[PDB]
Design a protein around this ligand. Structure first.
Ligand code: NA
Ligand SMILES: [Rh+]
Ligand SMILES: [Rh+]
Ligand SMILES: [Rh+]
Ligand SMILES: [Rh+]
Ligand SMILES: [Rh+]
Length: 129
């Protein structure tokens, strides 16, 4: 599924991401925009052979099992395929673990390079929340 901006903000809010570990909803929407262009089905292979999955580009080295990332972990205890669902529940639950891990939202390279320090409130402007 390719979400609209305000449609994703509403789903993220419902699933408890607004202010999760102090990160406003606009941070999460901005991250999803630059990681996946709001596409749940997005996949991107990494130089290390790991793959990033879903609306928040969650990596198979640490977070999910895809059966093709040797000596990786599955710290979210999910098949990476669960992260490509139209239902964002599994991505949001795994993203909560990731952002609690010590480097916060810097775990998302698109968030650090394109969202961090910017007017991220703009990403929820005009949305009924
Ligand atoms: Na893995
Ligand atoms: Rh939920
Ligand atoms: Rh819930
Ligand atoms: Rh766009
Ligand atoms: Rh870690
Ligand atoms: Rh509201």
């Amino acid at each position: 599924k390719v979400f609209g901006r305000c449609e994703l903000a509403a789903a993220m809010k419902r699933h408890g991401l607004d202010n999760y570990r102090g990160y406003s909803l606009g941070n999460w929407v901005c991250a999803a925009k630059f990681e996946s262009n709001f596409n749940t089905q997005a996949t991107n292979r990494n130089t290390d052979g790991s793959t990033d999955y879903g609306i928040l580009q969650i990596n198979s080295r640490w977070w999910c099992n895809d059966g093709r990332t040797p000596g990786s972990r599955n710290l979210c205890n999910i098949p990476c395929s669960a992260l490509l669902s139209s239902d964002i529940t599994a991505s949001v639950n795994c993203a909560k673990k990731i952002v609690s891990d010590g480097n916060g939202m810097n775990a998302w390279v698109a968030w650090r390079n394109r969202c961090k320090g910017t007017d991220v409130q703009a990403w929820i402007r005009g949305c009924r929340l």
